[PDB]
Design a binder for this molecule. Structure first.
Ligand SMILES: *[C@@H]1O[C@H](CO)[C@@H](O[C@@H]2O[C@H](CO)[C@@H](O)[C@H](O)[C@H]2NC(C)=O)[C@H](O)[C@H]1NC(C)=O
Ligand SMILES: *[C@@H]1O[C@H](CO)[C@@H](O[C@@H]2O[C@H](CO)[C@@H](O)[C@H](O)[C@H]2NC(C)=O)[C@H](O)[C@H]1NC(C)=O
Ligand SMILES: *[C@@H]1O[C@H](CO)[C@@H](O)[C@H](O)[C@H]1NC(C)=O
Ligand SMILES: *[C@@H]1O[C@H](CO)[C@@H](O)[C@H](O)[C@H]1NC(C)=O
Ligand SMILES: *[C@@H]1O[C@H](CO)[C@@H](O)[C@H](O)[C@H]1NC(C)=O
Ligand SMILES: *[C@@H]1O[C@H](CO)[C@@H](O)[C@H](O)[C@H]1NC(C)=O
Ligand SMILES: *[C@@H]1O[C@H](CO)[C@@H](O)[C@H](O)[C@H]1NC(C)=O
Ligand SMILES: *[C@@H]1O[C@H](CO)[C@@H](O)[C@H](O)[C@H]1NC(C)=O
Lengths: 214, 370, 346, 198, 50, 50
């Protein structure tokens, strides 16, 4: 496994909605990644703990240059439903299925270009949320330890899965490295510039200076 | 305005002026399919309440006036939207949940209401914006010997998510004795069977329930009503209808760099600033058309009845309309009073160093001066 | 905190302390006179192009006639506040072309013909250190049609029925009144406030003004050059202090800031729901039927009317404070510019 | 056992902030003003302190009011005895009579009574079924309790706005009184005044 | 109570106005005391001889 | 009755607040009148334009 610990700095900012806002400072409370938390490294070598707790939303990051990180297996135990995404990267096959059991063609199919698509190492940042039976995906690749700066994440897919998810694992089908961070309900103060892109943000519960700024 | 018949000398603020809209435009998406309710309302068997069927209906045209001809329901309950206005505005997708319940349990399908079936079988969110349909099913889902097709869940370890489905049947552990798949004295089956007889009262009768759930925009609209779209018009203050978003104003080609996932634009007061057109992918920013204040400048009623009109803040080359004299002012413009090159004391203060007074010209007129 | 330096006066019943030399000093006192004149349309702020909401607003009382009357009474009072302070002279006096006032310079406060606004140098410094917004009708109701990618709050305040009226006296006339007062008090003294102007040389009315503080007039006539040099140095130090520090005019900046943030809060209050289902009247009318939208529109009407009443009451209290400060400024202009005051520390 | 009003108004978020200047600093300010007035006259209000004997200072004060200074130096003991008797008389008047300080006591009573009324407004029902939020949250479901909590919120917000408006009006009156007191300190303590009955 | 808190944030922004008004009043009273009493540059002391 | 009570209470509170502000203005004018009576009727005034 080789769980190594590091710092997250100011990363994980995503668009809270799908409306345009220019030259304003907007305050939103949502499921975010807090500033200066500790994300965990992973070194899975194939020659692996089969349990990663969800904790109401997860932030994923990858610096790999190929399709080693394939998909995610969202679910709980093996007693009811419990199967999830089967993302692969050639051109298509973004199939999401809720097939029963069969670990170690049912509900949904998604077509065209897959979620991970990039060629100067790239950092792909993903946010997976599940609120009130609605399953939401955020994805953004950034050309670049984690660098310091701000880069926002755009929404891609909302889904009516409607399942309870508490355990996950990435699909690695040998060396790999992927960052895992955990989201909590927090309030931000997003700054919009003249072009409608988030350039700076303040976490309203980090230190009293940021509380004064909020 | 003054509620009086004699008006003293000075300047008063009467009712404001507006530029009325000329025409109306209706905009709707490019979809002409028909929504298939014919496999939702009439069926041979409905799903159980613990395993309720969810049907996604999208990318079609839904006529809600034919719902009354598909099932014999007494009422049509809704939360967050009127039953009569379902054909006017339009949504993104509509979800149908069809299941059968008992007569006691009709009231507990409601936002923020607990009980037995609402916290263990089917939980509705507190911000539910949709409609609930319930009707009697005596001759369709009953047998004289007892209808045992439908099941129910009554023991659970914890509470329930909004819109969650539970399928697996595991023996409940109500005590310290382990069950391990044995329904002993302290372990019971989580699902018993409904029993329906035609001899029961009206409070235990069959009831089929179809729940339609909506989503309020935030996406390109796919299901919309039969309202006919209209060609666009620009640079005129008109009444617009952008996917059920109504309003009045002038539309202009803009230069705001919208992201491809963005559709609307909000101001500080949370009003709509710019819209992406649904038919053609282009941006239009909405501005309210011309308005302003009207001031009446007059001497006393016993002196004369001549009136000058001041349009506050309006560069009045855009006024659609009142004498033949127009004088520009830093406070707006003056109509009915001519400008002179002399200078006297201020009689009626207009503003920005400009006053007005009723004076002889030879013969009597209202003049404006510095 | 420290109250100050510790001191002890060497008091004895046969000892006195007498000065042998002096210092002429020029101090600066800042006083607000007028605040921003505002006008509020109830029908367009509360409902806005809505027939049903206007007919529900007619079912209330005559609240908005009272609000419009209060705001008009404030707006007339601001022009009266400017008129009492600055217009205290009957005739616009003018200075002679020769500017030798007994050795005193007076070049940094008398106006120049080069500037088109006819303001002096220190007035230019005072008008530069206040970053004033909403001076009147700058946009002229057509600048907001020229849509900018960086939208300001002025167009949003304009589009909700919150207008700002221009003052009656423009700054050119205020500068003319100030120049008339300076040209009166240089060449005549206190005589132009009682009757007509009585001409007198400057070094003689300065000797008149030393007689009002208990100093005989030979002190001027034997020390005219030193007093003139001290006055010129004090004027230059006032110029340097106004050039360097931009936080000295803090009293006039708050008059802009309070009347900007009050209108900003009044604009931002339109985005609240007030317990209803939406903050947009068009969505309420599109979604619901007549009877339920009557309740939703009633809730929005009550919330917006309470917000407007709060704004009007705050403006009334602030206008009372501004009127008290304007009365103090008028008394200071009447008793110190137009004469000589024996009141201590006034 | 018997809860006072201070703890009752403290437990509902109605706190009282201390003044910036303590009473020792105010007493030091008044002691400095008195020492400067005795040892200097009016000269400590213009520049630096100039020492002067007090008989000569009071001779200057008689020259202020239009009486020649030979009146003082021939009647100094009578004036000193009259001033000492006047100070003792005002001391006995402050010790005996208790209704002379009705302006500051009115300020204290007004603030305490306004806070007491603001606390006592929490017991009203405002059309709801109860004046306690926990009883409404434990007796009803969500939908009706939202209406009852909305009624209580509207009533308490109206009461709070009334209190804030009354405090603003009283603050304006107190600021006018403080400006008058500052003018009286500048014109009468720091020098002689020619205004009648000021 | 979190339900009353949710309805209070859903209500409006009157409370920031009330907090600003009370803070301005408190700063005004501090300014009043400073303006009335602090009119002397140096803390003088009376001589021991009285 | 509750709706009418709320409306009439709001109107009465508006009337009382406006009367309080007008009373403050009249009190300021009365203090000025008392100062003028003390300083100009009971003695000569050296203040310019008073
Ligand atoms: C009174 O004070 C003034 C300063 O305000 C003294 O004037 C200065 O005198 C010195 C003596 O050489 C010069 O260097 C300075 O340039 C003077 N300052 C000016 C002219 O602004 C004056 O000498 C003092 N009178 C005395 C000591 O009798
Ligand atoms: C009066 O003040 C003016 C300042 O406005 C002086 O004019 C300046 O004099 C200096 C000489 O040290 C020059 O460098 C500046 O360019 C002048 N500024 C101007 C002309 O605007 C002037 O010298 C002073 N004295 C008199 C007698 O006029
Ligand atoms: C993350 O690691 C531990 C938690 O096990 C924590 O004590 C440490 O401070 C964190 N490091 C950071 C935030 O850099
Ligand atoms: C999800 O499942 C866990 C364990 O199966 C359960 O304890 C929890 O109550 C469920 N619901 C949630 C997290 O809403
Ligand atoms: C917005 O876009 C323009 C277009 O080139 C660019 O010049 C400007 O720097 C951008 N602003 C920001 C804050 O990115
Ligand atoms: C979209 O609308 C245009 C305009 O009438 C039409 O020509 C086109 O066929 C439509 N697209 C589809 C897929 O129907
Ligand atoms: C449902 O379909 C059947 C057969 O298509 C039809 O006879 C019937 O009228 C429909 N409606 C109901 C309410 O059964
Ligand atoms: C008014 O409109 C005219 C015509 O567009 C323009 O030339 C002028 O600058 C505008 N403003 C004023 C103050 O006249």
């Amino acid at each position: 496994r080789t769980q190594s610990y590091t710092n997250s700095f100011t990363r994980g900012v995503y668009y809270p909605d799908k409306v345009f806002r220019s030259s304003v400072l907007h305050s939103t409370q949502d499921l975010f990644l807090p500033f200066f938390s500790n994300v965990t490294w992973f070194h899975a070598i194939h020659v692996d703990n089969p349990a990663l707790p969800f904790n109401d939303g997860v932030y994923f990051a990858s610096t790999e240059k190929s399709n080693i990180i394939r998909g995610w297996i969202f679910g709980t135990t093996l007693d009811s439903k419990t199967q999830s995404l089967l993302i692969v990267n050639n051109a298509t096959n973004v199939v999401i299925k809720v097939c029963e059991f069969q670990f170690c063609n049912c509900t949904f199919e998604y077509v065209s270009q897959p979620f991970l698509m990039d060629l100067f190492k790239n950092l792909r940042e993903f946010v997976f949320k599940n609120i009130d039976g609605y399953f939401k995906i955020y994805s953004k690749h950034t050309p670049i330890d984690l660098p310091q700066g701000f880069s926002a994440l755009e929404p891609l897919v909302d889904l009516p899965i409607g399942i309870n998810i508490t355990r996950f694992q990435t699909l690695l089908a040998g060396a790999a490295a992927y960052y895992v961070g955990y989201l909590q309900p927090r309030t931000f103060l997003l700054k919009y510039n003249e072009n409608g892109t988030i350039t700076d943000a303040v976490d309203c519960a980090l230190d009293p200076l940021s509380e004064t700024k909020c | 305005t003054l509620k009086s018949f004699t008006v003293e000398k000075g300047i008063y603020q009467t009712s404001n002026f507006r530029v009325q809209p000329t025409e109306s435009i209706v905009r709707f998406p490019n979809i002409t399919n028909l929504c298939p309710f014919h496999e939702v309302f009439n069926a041979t068997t409905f799903a159980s309440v613990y395993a309720w069927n969810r049907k996604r209906i999208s990318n079609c045209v839904a006529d809600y006036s034919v719902i009354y001809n598909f099932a014999p329901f007494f009422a049509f309950k809704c939360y967050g939207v009127s039953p009569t206005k379902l054909n006017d505005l339009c949504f993104t997708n509509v979800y149908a949940d069809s299941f059968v319940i008992r007569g006691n349990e009709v009231s507990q399908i409601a936002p923020g209401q607990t009980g037995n079936i609402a916290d263990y079988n089917y939980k509705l969110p507190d911000d539910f914006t949709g409609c609930v349909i319930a009707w009697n099913s005596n001759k369709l889902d009953s047998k004289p010997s007892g209808n045992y097709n439908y099941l129910y869940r009554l023991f659970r370890k914890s509470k329930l998510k909004p819109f969650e489905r539970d399928i697996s049947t595991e023996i409940y552990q109500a005590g310290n004795r382990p069950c391990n798949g044995v329904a002993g004295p302290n372990c019971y089956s989580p699902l018993q069977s409904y029993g329906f007889r035609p001899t029961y009262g009206v409070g235990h009768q069959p009831y089929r329930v179809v729940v339609l759930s909506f989503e309020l925009l935030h996406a390109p609209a796919t299901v919309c009503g039969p309202k006919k779209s209209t060609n666009l018009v620009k640079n005129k203050c008109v009444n617009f209808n952008f996917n059920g978003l109504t309003g009045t104003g002038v539309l202009t080609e803009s230069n705001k760099k919208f992201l491809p996932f963005q559709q609307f634009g909000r101001d500080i007061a949370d009003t709509t600033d710019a819209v992406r057109d649904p038919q053609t992918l282009e941006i239009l920013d909405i501005t309210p058309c011309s308005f302003g204040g009207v001031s009446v400048i007059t001497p006393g009623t016993n002196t004369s009845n001549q009136v000058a009109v001041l349009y506050q803040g309006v560069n009045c080359t855009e006024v659609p309309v009142t004498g033949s004299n127009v004088f520009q002012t830093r406070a707006g413009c003056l109509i009915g009073a001519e400008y002179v090159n002399n200078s006297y004391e201020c009689d009626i203060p207009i503003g920005a160093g400009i006053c007005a007074s009723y004076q002889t010209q030879t013969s009597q007129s209202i003049i404006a001066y510095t | 905190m420290s109250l100050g330096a510790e001191n002890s006066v060497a008091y004895s019943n046969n000892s006195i302390a007498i000065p042998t030399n002096f210092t002429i000093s020029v101090t600066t006192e800042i006083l607000p006179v007028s605040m921003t004149k505002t006008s509020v349309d109830c029908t367009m702020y509360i409902c806005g192009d809505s027939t049903e909401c206007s007919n529900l607003l007619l079912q209330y009382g005559s609240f908005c006639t009272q609000l419009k009357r209060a705001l008009t009474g404030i707006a007339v009072e601001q022009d009266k506040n400017t008129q009492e302070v600055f217009a205290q002279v009957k005739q616009i006096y003018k200075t002679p072309p020769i500017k030798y006032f007994g050795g005193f310079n007076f070049s940094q406060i008398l106006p120049d013909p080069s500037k088109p606004s006819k303001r002096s140098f220190i007035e230019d410094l005072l008008f530069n250190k206040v970053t004033l917004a909403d001076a009147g009708f700058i946009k002229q109701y057509g600048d907001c049609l020229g849509d900018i990618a960086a939208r300001d709050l002025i167009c949003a305040q304009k589009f909700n029925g919150l207008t700002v009226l221009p003052p009656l006296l423009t700054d050119e006339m205020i500068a003319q009144y100030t120049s008339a007062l300076l040209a009166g008090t240089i060449t005549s003294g206190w005589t132009f406030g009682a009757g007509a102007a009585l001409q007198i040389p400057f070094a003689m009315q300065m000797a008149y003004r030393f007689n009002g503080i208990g100093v005989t007039q030979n002190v001027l006539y034997e020390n005219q050059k030193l007093i003139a040099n001290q006055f010129n140095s004090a004027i230059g130090k006032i110029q340097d202090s106004l050039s360097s520090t931009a936080s000295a005019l803090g009293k006039l900046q708050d008059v802009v800031n309070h009347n900007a943030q009050a209108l900003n809060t009044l604009v931002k209050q339109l985005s609240s729901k007030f317990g209803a289902i939406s903050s947009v009247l068009n969505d309420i009318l599109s979604r619901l039927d007549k009877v339920e939208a009557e309740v939703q529109i009633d809730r929005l009407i009550t919330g917006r009317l309470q917000s407007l009443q709060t704004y009007v009451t705050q403006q009334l209290i602030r206008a009372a404070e501004i009127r008290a400060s304007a009365n103090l400024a008028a008394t200071k202009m009447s008793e110190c510019v137009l004469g000589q005051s024996k009141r201590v520390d006034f």
